[model samples]
Target: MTEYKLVVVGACGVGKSALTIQLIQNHFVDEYDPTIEDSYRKQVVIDGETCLLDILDTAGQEEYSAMRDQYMRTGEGFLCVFAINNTKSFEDIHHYREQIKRVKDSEDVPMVLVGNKCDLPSRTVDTKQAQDLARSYGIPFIETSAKTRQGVDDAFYTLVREIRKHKE
Candidate 1:
């Protein structure tokens, strides 16, 4: 068994909490207030291996920016999330990526680029654009929906796979 410490970071209202909640609780929460910081644990079989995931749902508000560095220091992997319909949220992913690298002091850290809220009808971030950015970063890009639970497990599982490779 292995444990993956994953951090979820993104712009405000990008469904960071919703994604986390959907994964852990197996349901969608439509009316959650903004998150400060929340931790969840789950045990699952990924690729025939039992893995324990410790997930941190972080605050996206600037007021809580000071606390981000602390978790950044300890997280083993990250899911850099952005809402497909929100262009500004997509733009803010760069900052989160920079912060993670700066805090970890490594460019090769395990991470995944996630496009959340895929159930929405409108999209501002093109799939190709997001895929291109992920390609540039040499990471996996996955589109997910908390409401539909689509691609949610794949995003987290991909991060775990990255962490495994990083460790090897």
Candidate 2:
């Protein structure tokens, strides 16, 4: 089976863990603690091609920045996430991108910008803004909702498909 390591990152309360849980186990934690360190592993098969997704769900706060850096260094790809309803999380995109650069020392890493919590109607960030950011960074973007499972599978699967195609 092919194996892929994915690093999920964003500011606190952006639903990084929720997204991971939703994709891996089809579950969501209502009372998630942002201070806890967590990671998960799962397998996904697309068109009978098996690929193991080992996901590192890091704490969102700055206190765990080092740990986040550590995971990014070894990640094969990234799911750079931010909450659509939180502008602060969106503002941190540059920081997260810089962290990835620091770890990989290259600008060619495959990444997908995820705008989470799209199920909420009161989003603070606009889709156009997210798209602009992704375009500027040369990465793909998707608005996702872990609570409703909207675009959750697409977020991961699309990134995997892009990576596979790039390799060819």
Candidate 3:
């Protein structure tokens, strides 16, 4: 009956909202106007277990940068996302990681690195590059497409597992 508070973070146009919509709603959104923080609640079974998931679909815009520390402090876990076609989004992940670690007061905070927009052909960020970065951080790297809804569930479930693993 444990609950996990997961934060979806990245830059604007990185597909944070889209990924989430695909996650809980199983609905794909082509475009997200972008908002600050939206709460998503649902139940899921992972590793033959059931639990409540409270996801915070955080805004990727620069205006919300000041809120990162608070978000990192409160979040039980994090999913750092970036679209494959955007290198800037991918580059921002480093800052996100550092901020999360600094605010959480621990480097042990659970996280999953995601490369979204895998369905598109104009991807600029290579899978190898992302994987290398994930290895550097010791977090799992996953590529997902909100349009195709590929790897969406796995990303969330993997983060949940990571959180539980760190919890223990």
Which candidate has the highest lDDT of all? 1
RMSD of each: 1.8, 2.1, 1.8
Ranking by TM-score: 1, 3, 2
Taken over the whole model, the C-alpha lDDT of each candidate is 0.90, 0.86, 0.89
lDDT of 2 at 87: 96
Q: What lDDT, from 0 to 1, does candidate 2 have?
A: 0.86
After superposing candidate 1, which stretches have Cα over 4 Å from the reference? 60-68
| Model 3 spans > 4 angstroms off | 60-68
Can you write out model 3's per-residue Cα lDDT over 1-168, one digit (the tens) per residue? Answer: 989999998888888999998888888887666765698999999999999999999874543365755655999889999999999999999988877887787769999999999999998999999999999999999999988999999999999999999988
Span of ten consecutive residues with least summed lDDT in model 1 = 60-69
TM-score of each: 0.94, 0.90, 0.93
- Per-residue lDDT value at 11 in model 1: 88
Candidate 2 clash pair list = none
Q: Model 3, residue 51: what's the lDDT?
A: 95
